[PDB]
Each structure stands twice: as structure tokens, then as C-alpha cells.
């Protein structure tokens, strides 16, 4: 599923991401924009052989099981395929664990490089929320 901007903001808010660990909704929308272009089915292979899955490009090295990432963990206790669903629940629940891991949203390199410090509220501007 490719979400619209405000549609994803609303779904993220419904699932409790707005101000989660102190990160406003616009931060989460911005991260999803640059990780996946709002596409739940996005996948990307990393150089190390792990793969990133879904709207927030969650990595198989630590967070989900895809059966093909040697030495990896599955700390969200989910198949990586669950991160590709039109229902964002699994991605949101796993993102909550990731953002709580110690480095906040810096875990998402694209957030650090493209969202951090910017006018992230622009991402939810106009949205009925």
C-alpha cells in the first residue's frame, strides 16, 4: 500500500506514534517519506546481506526474521514480511522498540540526514488529525 501523506500521519497517530519517545508526528512522517516514499512494500538489500522492510525500512540484522541474515536477531519477534502489510501495526510496534534502543530516531540514518533539525511539522501541515 502506498499511503498518502496525511493518511499515514493519521494512521501513525492512531497507533500511538505521535510524540512517542518525544518525537512529534512530523518526524515519523518525514522518516517514512525518505525511507520508503510511504510504500509499505518497500524492500532494500544492504551491503552486509541484511534487508530493510516496509514503511520505516526496519532491518533484518536486529529486528525481524527473514531466514537469510546470518548471525542476526529478531528482537521485534516478527517475520520481516509482517513489515510489508497494508496494516502498519507491526511496523509501528517494532519502530517503538527501535526508537527506545538508546539513540532515538538516529537509528534511521535517513531521518538523521534528511529530517533531523528541519521543519518536520510541514509533513503534517493541513492534515485533519
Pick the closer one to Na ion by CB: 67 or 126.
Answer: 67
Pick the closer one to Na ion by CB: 27 or 60.
Answer: 60
Q: Is the dihedral of CA 12, 14, 17, 19 positive or negative?
A: positive
Site membership for Cl ion, residue 54 (CB under 5 A): no
Sheet strands side by side (includes 58-59): 43-45, 51-53, 58-59
**Active-site residue, selected from the candidate residues 7, 18, 48, 52:** 52
Count residues binding Cl ion (CB under 5 A).
Answer: 16
How far CA 124 is from CA of 10, 69, 115, in Å, comes to 9, 35, 13
Query: How far apart are the C-alpha atoms of 121 and 129, rounded to whole Å?
Result: 13
- Find the part of the chain contacting Cl ion (CB under 5 A) among 3-11, 42-50, 90-98, 107-115: 3-11
How far CA 95 is from CA of 17, 70, 111, 112, in Å, comes to 9, 22, 13, 15
State the binding partner of 26 from Na ion, Cl ion, none, CB within 5 to 8 A by kind. Cl ion
Q: In 10 A of CB 93, how many CB atoms?
A: 16
Site membership for Cl ion, residue 74 (CB under 5 A): yes
Least distance from Cl ion to the Cβ atom of residue 83, Å: 11
Q: Is 7 a catalytic residue?
A: no
Q: Is 52 a catalytic residue?
A: yes
Site membership for Cl ion, residue 5 (CB under 5 A): yes
Residues forming the annotated binding site for substrate?
A: 101
Q: What is the contact surface with Na ion in residues (CB under 5 A)?
A: 60, 65, 69, 72, 74
Amino acid at each position: 500500500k502506498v499511503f498518502g501523506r496525511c493518511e499515514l500521519a493519521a494512521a501513525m497517530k492512531r497507533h500511538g506514534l505521535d510524540n512517542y519517545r518525544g518525537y512529534s508526528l512530523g518526524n515519523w512522517v518525514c522518516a517514512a517519506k525518505f525511507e520508503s516514499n510511504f510504500n509499505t512494500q518497500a524492500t532494500n538489500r544492504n551491503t552486509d546481506g541484511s534487508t530493510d522492510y516496509g514503511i520505516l525500512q526496519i532491518n533484518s540484522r536486529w529486528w525481524c526474521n527473514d531466514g537469510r541474515t546470518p548471525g542476526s536477531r529478531n528482537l521485534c519477534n516478527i517475520p520481516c514480511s509482517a513489515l510489508l502489510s497494508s496494516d502498519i501495526t507491526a511496523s509501528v510496534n517494532c519502530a517503538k522498540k527501535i526508537v527506545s534502543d538508546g539513540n532515538g530516531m538516529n537509528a534511521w540514518v535517513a531521518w538523521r540526514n534528511r529530517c533531523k533539525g528541519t521543519d518536520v511539522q510541514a509533513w503534517i501541515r493541513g492534515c485533519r488529525l
